[model samples]
Target: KVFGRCELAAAMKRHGLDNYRGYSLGNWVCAAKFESNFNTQATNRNTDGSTDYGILQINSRWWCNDGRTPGSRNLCNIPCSALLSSDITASVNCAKKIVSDGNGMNAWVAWRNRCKGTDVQAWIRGCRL
Candidate 1:
């Protein structure tokens, strides 16, 4: 509920997540723009009244399984913010791995193949890591 920009940036930096920070940031913004326009408070209580909460747009039902309190992270298996927060280096590493091991723009592969095209990248200085 209370996220920090500087904290987030620092977290991302420490994780070698920089190369695509811009992309990730852009993607994050765009996701919110189209979904809820970057509103942390955006709640989509479906017709059935289920609640989707937080900046990354996760749902409470998913989070509630965690005892409905602090340390919600462990309960939910850690979301993007949490995983990326602790390591703060996965994105860049993932991009690098995807690019190298996969041989070419894995960004496209990952985006298209797995994410249905949400992951984004371009000429993007492959191995920009």
Candidate 2:
């Protein structure tokens, strides 16, 4: 499921991530744009022999089990495919845990490399809150 930016913003707000853990909504929005472009089923193979899944690109190395992988901690207690669904609840919950674990958005390299320190008002521009 491919979502537009405004749809993404609205969904994030509904998930109560509008302003979470000192990061603004734009931060997550921008991260998602760079991470998966709002594609629900997006997946990526990392250089470190891990796979990133879904909108926030949760990593298989520490978060979820991809079945083909061997060393996932499965701290999120879910299959990696769960993150790829159109219903984002599992992904959102896992992200919340990731953030609350003290890594914050730094858990996502996309946030660090693409969203951090950037002015991203345009990320949610024209979206109704």
Candidate 3:
């Protein structure tokens, strides 16, 4: 199950996507790979056994999910499904917004240098896949 970034970007381009809107899938994958081993089911837990965070390393508690953040919204019938509900488009848009807010993982080029060249083994490992 290899995800191709070119396919992703081109798909978004068809929808009039520019910049990282429909084109940053590569960076998104890069960030997720480095941050969570590209595991869609990835999560983090607390010792209390009450805190459970999920993939993309997204802290569900921190995420506003207010639709203002791109992929998250009340209208999302999928219930907590970010990219799963809206797919790469919504994720890419949200990712761009995050980047715009001085976070990171917005531009594909930046992700290449910032995350790809990092010391993380999973990112390096994902490079081969």
Candidate 4:
């Protein structure tokens, strides 16, 4: 499922991502844009054999367990498949854990290169959140 810009912003806000760990809602929304373009089923395999899944692109190497990523820590304690679902609950939960783990939003390179230090209000403008 693909989400509209504000739709995803509202979702992230509802999941308590607003100012989460000092990252604003726009930061989260912008990261999702670059990471998966708001597609719930997005997936990418890394050169190290790890996979990224879902809107936030939680990685298999350290977060979700894909049963194939070598040395996966499974810190999220969820199957990587859970992140692929249309429901963003699991993805949001896992993302919170990722941030809490001290990686911050830098856990996603997309966020680092695109959203970080940028004025990201446009990503959530007119959302009425």
| TM-scores vs. true structure, each candidate | 0.35, 0.94, 0.41, 0.97
Question: Against the correct fold, how does model 4 do in TM-score?
Answer: 0.97
Output the worst ten-in-a-row residue range by lDDT, candidate 1.
Answer: 120-129
State the displacement of the C-alpha of residue 5, model 3, in Å, after optimal TM-score superposition. 6.5
RMSD of each: 9.5, 1.1, 7.9, 0.8
Indicate the residue-level lDDT of 12 in model 4: 91
Q: List the residue pairs that clash in candidate 4.
A: none
Per-residue lDDT of model 4, residues 1-129, tens digit only: 899999999889999999989988999999999999999999999999999999999999999989999777999899999998988999999999998987798878999999999999889989978
Q: Please, what is the whole-model Cα lDDT of each candidate in the order they appear?
A: 0.37, 0.88, 0.40, 0.92
Superposed Cα deviation of residue 98, candidate 3 (Å) = 1.4
Whole-model lDDT, candidate 1? 0.37
lDDT of 1 by residue, 1-129 (tens): 233444444444455544443344333323323433333454455343334443334443433222343333332444434322333233334333433433343333223343335543321223222
Instruction: Report the Cα lDDT for candidate 2.
Output: 0.88
Q: For candidate 3, what is the TM-score?
A: 0.41
Residue-level lDDT of model 3, residues 1-129, one tens digit each, is: 223444433444443434453333444545655544543444454343322222244433334242323333332222234543324444444444545545454333435556654553332233322
Clashing pairs in 3: none
